[PDB]
């Protein structure tokens, strides 16, 4: 059967409200006058006052902004009756999908991370891991998917890019010889976490690596 497609609405809309989403119609309206209604959470049960339908035209309406992180989906039903109140259709299921906007920035779990590694180790050796979270959707979008990088290293002795970082895991690894405790006992790495898998907003934290005997 032909139905109303799921209605996809981005969270944080500006309106104007009320906003027309889609128009219900029963083809029994050429013969008789038809009246429409909606039921379900958001329409005639909580949350209150989120949706409505225009009784005579069948236009489905959104009355307020939505927030995907509160409620991601709504399930409503559209009904069509004649003037005497008799049903003229099986109810129509109407889905509303609230699609994610990138309304959260990434946040490191702590502002300074510490680790330690032996002067001897070969390139490829894992040292430490850093982590950032992001409360947006990480399944259907990248808004909650964080990419990591090393903005810079201090000091640059013996040279720069002593370390690398895996852009998804946040694992920091040694990628060159030669570290020496006596020479440079400590590196300071400015690390960045960028949502939209590298295309979005950035947060910065520090990772200190002590060189050991």
């Amino acid at each position, epitope marked *: 059967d032909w139905v109303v497609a799921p209605i996809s609405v981005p969270e944080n809309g500006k309106g104007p*409200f009320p906003q027309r989403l889609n128009q219900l119609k029963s083809n029994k309206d050429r013969d008789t006058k038809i009246f429409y209604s909606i*039921t379900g959470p958001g329409a005639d049960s909580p949350p209150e*006052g989120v949706f409505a339908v225009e*009784k005579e035209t069948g236009w489905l309406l959104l009355n307020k*902004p939505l927030d995907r992180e509160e409620i991601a989906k709504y399930e409503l039903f559209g009904h069509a009756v004649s003037e005497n109140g008799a049903s003229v259709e099986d109810p129509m299921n109407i889905s509303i999908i609230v699609t994610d906007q990138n309304d959260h920035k990434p946040k490191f779990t702590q502002d300074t991370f510490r680790g330690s590694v032996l002067e001897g180790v070969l390139p490829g050796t894992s040292v430490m891991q850093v982590t950032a979270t992001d409360e947006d959707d990480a399944i259907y979008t990248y808004n909650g998917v964080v990419a990591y990088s090393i903005h810079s290293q201090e000091p640059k002795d013996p040279h720069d890019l002593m370390f690398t970082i895996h852009r998804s895991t946040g694992t920091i690894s040694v990628i060159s010889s030669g570290l020496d405790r006596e020479k440079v006992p400590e590196y300071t790495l400015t690390i960045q976490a960028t949502d939209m898998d590298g295309d979005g907003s950035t947060t910065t934290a520090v990772a200190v690596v002590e060189i050991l005997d």
Partner: single-chain antibody
Framework: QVQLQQPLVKPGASVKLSCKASGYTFTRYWINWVKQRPGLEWIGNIYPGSNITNYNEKFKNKATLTVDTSSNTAYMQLSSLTSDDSAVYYC???????????????WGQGTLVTVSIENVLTQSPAIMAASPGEKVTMTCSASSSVSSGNFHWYQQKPGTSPKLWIYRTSNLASGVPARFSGSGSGTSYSLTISSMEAEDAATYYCQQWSGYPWTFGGGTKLE
């Protein structure tokens, strides 16, 4: 319980009116403002969580609506006052929850200010009188069509805020007796009392929405 609490200036000054909200989550419900002088007018409304407004073009330049989320308070600033601004100002929260466009049945008690392209609703008669037992009917006509879902009636007695009476053409509000009945469609609507009573004497106002702004009739005073 949903409650809106509202607590004298010279011409040209500004004043900020407050509407303190409790009994529900403040951020997720539209608050509307309304003016009254010796009829009723819709000024505008605001959705607190996002600070989104709708204004009546008529008050675009007088009124600014704000909120303070921290204190669950809506504000309306009135600028550059004249004698015309002296009125009663009500706040009112949305609405009735049955799948149709909400209205606003929860009013504050109003604040009194004394100063030293729409669907017009014509109500008649302006003043009428009757005796108990008699049938009473009154009428409201609109320059343009209105959904039966968006046509409402209120009762107001002097000294008190308006009080939702009938909604969506024919449903009786909570405290309202069976004697009352509403009907109508398109552009013509009516309110009817099978048998008048002492209780029922008051000013009755029709109300519509069909896109913004909300409008009211000039009122029917029953005695």
């Amino acid at each position: 319980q949903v409650q809106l609490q509202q607590p004298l200036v010279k011409p040209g000054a500004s004043v900020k009116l407050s509407c303190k909200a409790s009994g529900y989550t403040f951020t997720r419900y539209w608050i509307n403002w309304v003016k009254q002088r010796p009829g009723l007018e819709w000024i505008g409304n605001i959705y607190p969580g996002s600070n989104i407004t709708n204004y009546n073009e008529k008050f675009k330049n007088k009124a600014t609506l704000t909120v303070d989320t921290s204190s669950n308070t809506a504000y309306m600033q009135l600028s550059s006052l004249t004698s015309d601004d002296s009125a009663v100002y009500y706040c009112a929260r949305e609405g009735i929850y049955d799948g149709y466009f909400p209205l606003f049945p929860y009013w504050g008690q109003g604040t009194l200010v004394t100063v030293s392209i729409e669907n017009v609703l014509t109500q008649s008669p302006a003043i009428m009188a009757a005796s108990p037992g008699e049938k009473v009917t009154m009428t409201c006509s609109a320059s343009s069509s209105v959904s039966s879902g968006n046509f409402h009636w209120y009762q107001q007695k002097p000294g008190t805020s308006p009080k939702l009476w009938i909604y969506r053409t024919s449903n009786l509000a909570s405290g309202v007796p069976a004697r009352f009945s509403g009907s109508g469609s398109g552009t013509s609507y009516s309110l009817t009392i099978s048998s008048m009573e002492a209780e029922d004497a008051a000013t009755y106002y029709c109300q519509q929405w069909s896109g913004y702004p909300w409008t009211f009739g000039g009122g029917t005073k029953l005695e």
